[model samples]
Target: RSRSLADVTASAEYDKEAADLSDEKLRKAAGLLNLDDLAESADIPQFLAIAREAAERRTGLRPFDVQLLGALRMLAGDVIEMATGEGKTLAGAIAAAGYALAGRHVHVVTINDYLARRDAEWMGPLLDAMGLTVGWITADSTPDERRTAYDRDVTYASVNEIGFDVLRDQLVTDVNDLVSPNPDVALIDEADSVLVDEALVPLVLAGTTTPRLEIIRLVAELVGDKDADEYFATDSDNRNVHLTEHGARKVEKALGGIDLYSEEHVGTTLTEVNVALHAHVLLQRDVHYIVRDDAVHLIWPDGLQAAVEAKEGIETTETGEVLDTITVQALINRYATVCGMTGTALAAGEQLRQFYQLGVSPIPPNKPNIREDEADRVYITTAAKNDGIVEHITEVHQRGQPVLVGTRDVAESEELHERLVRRGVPAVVLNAKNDAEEARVIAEAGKYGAVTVSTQMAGRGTDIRLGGSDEADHDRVAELGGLHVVGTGRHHTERLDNQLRGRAGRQGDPGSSVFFSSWEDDVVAANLDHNKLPMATDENGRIVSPRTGSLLDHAQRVAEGRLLDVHANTWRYNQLIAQQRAIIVERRNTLLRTVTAREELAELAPKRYEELSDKVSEERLETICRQIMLYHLDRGWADHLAYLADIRESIHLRALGRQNPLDEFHRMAVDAFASLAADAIEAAQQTFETAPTSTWTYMVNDNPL
Candidate 1:
């Protein structure tokens, strides 16, 4: 059911009625009314009125009707789509405070640490005025610092930090050492990016182990130039690749004539060749990932890092034995209730509903959007598209119209930046190479005569104003038609395009956006047959066919479908794994918080327990026992995660044996997990003296497919 905007509109009337209250009176009045009690009585109107008044007094900004509506929808547990520059940050904070007032601790999840810190500090006074305590977590937050933050009524933290915290908490031997509490309510900012774009990206906690650099290097070299037709083949959507009989023979010969298909070698020798081959052949360097500072970091919806590193000739980092892991989907699911706000949400509304049982509500803009969105400029080839884009950029530059050109990858951004520089356009490039200057570069992108080119627009949380930071030439820049957003080409998903376009026309600002794409672009070429195009072209190499828009739309839809399929397939496997993770977490928490660990050890080993008790104080004995039990449990879970990863890699081969891979995986996982507790206890009792130590955390650039 759709929410009634009239309800939020009527609520605003209450705030207007209280406009006469002085700042002191409003703060005193709001402080007296306990939101925890008001929430229980379902009296939200009074709280909202006072909260809105306090926000205006504290932040010096008034909430629009649309912002109120979006906040209300979020409070009602819906993911609300508020357009860019609509103050989603403010709305998210309001909902977070509302949840906190309802006797629930709230975690305001952001896309990155910068936003996490920015929003918390920006909204601190308002939340404080509402009588709610707030704090934020960052990557640099110390254990003591995080502990203090998590104890607040409302905590602001990045989705990555939250996931990492959860993983770290699982290994804590003492309850006091835990830096994160149990999952509570989550108010997600950039909902679509966090919920859908990164749903399957695993955040891993691992114990370091040496990487198989030599073997991977040899394999990457061996299959680097294996031709497609005879040696290997890729699926229609190019999501997967496999080696043919000929490819296997070539590899076997190269590896000293070993049997690649033998059961002994299939899991070891063959798996390496396949992973290396897939990384080298299917994964592109600049588009899917980037090489930076002697490491491979994935940029798109993913790849295996070590495999990519081998192919890229980088010093491959150490692989590890996973101690614990969680995906964005799995971590978000831990919360009791989840509500979110995003500039682009309705596009993936169905996915959100299917995966998280969340509904979407589209909030109208506070003012009529006056941004002029131009149609795509279609070209026949990359060269033509490049020239066309440059011509448009130069034309716009002549008028001193600030332009933001969003490209597909670092290469494209650099290529365009060089051309702009040669033409005296003086463009600022914002690719991965110099992302450290994002703050300053993005800040000046809307100044008169300013041109900035960047790669992807999903997580750039800053806004581009009509003029520079001081707004010195605001009126003059406004007259030049505001910031013009030009896309180098259509992204794999339209939401990304919308995000780029959104950089311009924010909050009823006067601006315009258009995309330039070629038939040779990956988005078009991968999904459409060039031969089927109409034989019509202009002298500028532009396609004159009226069906070009529809053709482009078809390509985007197909690309989206392929991604959906990958998500669905990966989620099927992750469901059981998440459940098992929950079980282990519950067991671990029980041992950490209570006397369970000591009591179990005492009962299982009464003689040794007595000996320890006689030798040490009771407090010291309890500490030692808890540490031992936690060590065993953690070690057991780590081994279990490692085993699961192995099975997942080769599970597809089960299909050849006429067994469903997913079902077989579930069966194997269940059987293994069933023995986990017993095995852990057995190991703990046998050697209660030693414990695993020295672990590190990092994200594995893993493929969802």
Candidate 2:
């Protein structure tokens, strides 16, 4: 169970000739190796020998001892921490194939559509030779294509794509519309990003709402850029905002003398103002969101597009409703078994276990790590920090060493790019604007004397191969120290900072990394202790000493802690919704799969059914009944969602009344869902005669009214 780097390094030998053999020959070779027979023994020594042979023959790439060990660990359902460039793709394939041989379907969840398709195809030969079929799903795939992909012994899909599929399936009236099977094994790629960073993100499903920004825009107008202390009081961390008594009264007069904070008006005028207030004060561009032509662009976990839900990112309305919703953490938790591999899992060790109960198994790299990492250099001001970062880039570029400058957002990345290029250093910039070219830009970062500035999220999942490959003159570049990483500032989560550092020094490559943090960085500004802050000198500012550094660490801790709290806080409210969803999905499924739903019609409308049968086919009667149930159930659920949204707008009012908002949310959720069932039944009974008419359903814009 516990071992060192060399413990699992004893390599297995396999016949190279076996790869060239026919598919039958490969199976015979596996037969001779008795790998399939060892299903009971669960032995890897033999299993991996056959797998390695099959891999080498078809793909012509042999699995390293470490990759094989990772495969075995995954088979046992342990989260494996394999460093970048350590062939996680190969290890995952072996594990997936091994599982298929033992009679199970596996889902390898990746960060995006690209990897899902790329890995499945790249590993095609190996899986095929092992007598296993593999396929992948992407965002653009149609229903038929999706069905074919999920039918494979092993399938791959981006987490959000698969999650959206689940949402679509939940609303299906026909059983055949469901694409994904029941939850089984999920080998998550970038496990930390998937399981921790995105764990709290809510995947939502919505249809057309009234389609207006009246409340949101009006509220924005009323709360426009007021003095922070005078107009609003913030919680300790600046997360929650509340209007001051004076400002509250001020807003009431602005709203034509309405009581904006009182319970009677909490649903309308008060709620509207606060919605836009947060957008103006808290959701600053370049950090929480990106601003384009006319509207703000939203950013959430798993790279959800800002266009769909946020639609111009104004929150639709202060009263946006949830048609259906789920959390990534709760959604993935449905898997019967789960394992994952990431380059940075150890950094999030505790979260991995706390939420997923998946223990971390650190896989030793195939090659040793020889990259030099230096201590962070603290600065006092953004001006000095920017100057210092440029100077570092100049020094490194002069030495002909490639440099990558990692920033926190689009604004910072662009700013660094401007300085670097103006200083006679032409750099390739990667940001949300150029998201489509992300992989190409990141892959080119290791070229000789290349200066690339990119955000943390863009740099990850895209391999930063040092030496920039054959054309970039890898040999010559490797001589000048593989790649140098420079961080503009510290990020709130050190895991992300480490991930940027990880870009260099991959697979024993010669590389180095250091960060320059300033007092002006969001990490510090978001959590500064006003009275005890360090001094900002004439040259700029910084947290100077160990004490100052403590301030930085404290700030970072508070930030991470706040995020962890947000995760828990979000789950508290969504948990009940998730439970309600399960109930509705089950009930809806009964209508599609069993006689229970049909029986409701028979019992409630025996006379009506006979009348319908006299006029049409019995089959038509069944079809009419099915549509009636679906329409009523779906319509009622949507109504329930709308009810919850109204409650959510005023749920904060509960806190002011000395009660927990989450507890109250749970109370209403149960009550609302309970009412939905009876309402659905009643609506169905009334619509039974009307259901005899032809019917159909179509989707509309998912925006809020």
Candidate 3:
């Protein structure tokens, strides 16, 4: 509804009512208020007033009158923008319960499985008090397990699992195999990260059948031939990778005169080439990914063990083969209604509207934010950046102030750790080198005299309670101006920097944050070559001019704008795919609802089914009929998905050649999907002939992009 934070505070009556009641007093009034009447009613004020005290009674902590405002705004279908440490979890819970009480099914989408379970447990009392059923889904949940979970009035799941489950639902042969109910209202947690930051990525479901081993080895072998400039070429930002023309001609020469981009070489080999090329070139150890017991781990932005598309075709040692997929954006679109809560959603206002038609409503903090954010300390070189960072840390650490350093990747964090220790400033590092203990590590970062160096993900979804909730220790650290956040470099997007900065000054705590950036940092260097530019480096290698800071910011903004363009372009291509999938899924559901597959067999494979009727009765016929339809439907979908991927992967080239790739791709996908029906019918004949083969199910390799 395009609501602002002001709208929350505008309701004077709601706040006045909320301010006038204690939990015990409000509970008595809440008994007079009807829970069953809440959802269907338009009286948001009344609901919040009652829901507020109900939450306080069940949850121990009383909701600030402000919390009621956020909950009301969320109920009105806005993305509630509560700041860090503002208790968004409880606000979201209260909103979800309100919707469920109104008799609408609710799906609370959290950031991860751990939080999904945690919320379902934490919010258990609030929902139970209102007489609603709640359950959660995990990545590994079985059909029966998820079926039960989905049956509840409110189900909470990691956003990833929902997309994955939706993809899995497409192949269901029986109504029994359907695990997700019709998606109702979805209350998203970390809405910006899920809907905006990850809007373009697809959740693909593909077969686990291993790749042709010989081909995998051959491509890997060819990619091993890295001659720097001659072999692989990347754009200025170094995010995209392609083979140099000379390198390709050499590869053709090496592979017996095969033109790599020839029509015959296009679909079947392009993915493999990119995978192998990335394997040897852009993907390097120490920074991008790491190895553990021969297992390849793609690190998250915050240094998690499990985690993107610039990374497609790169396999994790812990992963399996792809089958099918959908993006979180498309998955959320399947819902009838959507609302969310995030501490930092207002910054992504355009994205929320563009992707989800949701507005951001700022939720007033329980306490004012007093965290003073300092400007980025600009330098001309990496050495200077490191020196400045170390000196800054040394200054803060020696004075009994806690310092938390954020690095872009694992190797950089380690580098900073070494530099800090060399200066006799011992620091605790929480990078991907050992991707565990996030909460414990971040919690300790607030202790007095503590120096912690970690990646962005290390502090995600975990709060760093100042001094770990020890009042005496907290006071000591607070006297030193709380935890000091230091960034080795500014991220490509300011939001990431803000996230790191947010680690300090939580809940009106006394704290501060600053970033140190050099021209050598990837955010600037990946786009601008300082050697070619007339960068004015000082005697100490600091970029002294005020204009240089603006230049750095401009570079980052440009980088982010470029990414958003790609993101939007990707969304356009997938829009038709999402529509196509919904139609196909609807057809599959219709087939599963009756004995129609038997009739379908009668039209295509009648003789075989008559010959096949020797095995069983009507019940068995229903089973086998569904199985045959399932096999053909799944096989046909897999074939079409692969074909579509090839087209999407290469569409940008046509777009570069002055064609509308979105329009071109859309026309081709429509024609191809029409062709899929014929393929499925043809395959149904073969599937009927091979009827008694054993079939099974397992989780698809989650493409963690």
Best-fitting candidate, scored by TM-score: 1
Candidate 1, residue 406: the lDDT equals 89
All candidates' TM-scores?
A: 0.80, 0.78, 0.76
By lDDT, highest first, what's the ranking? 1, 2, 3
lDDT of 1 at 2: 40
How much lDDT does candidate 1 score?
0.79
Better of 2 and 3 by TM-score: 2
lDDT by residue for model 1 (232-276), tens: 443474665777776677667877879987987877776676676
In Å, residue 351's CA in model 1 sits off its true spot by: 0.6
Residue 224, model 3: lDDT of: 59
- Model 1 stretches astray by more than 4 angstroms: 1-4, 11-17, 22-24, 32-42, 209-319, 432-437, 470-472, 594-606, 609-614, 652-661, 688-693, 702-705
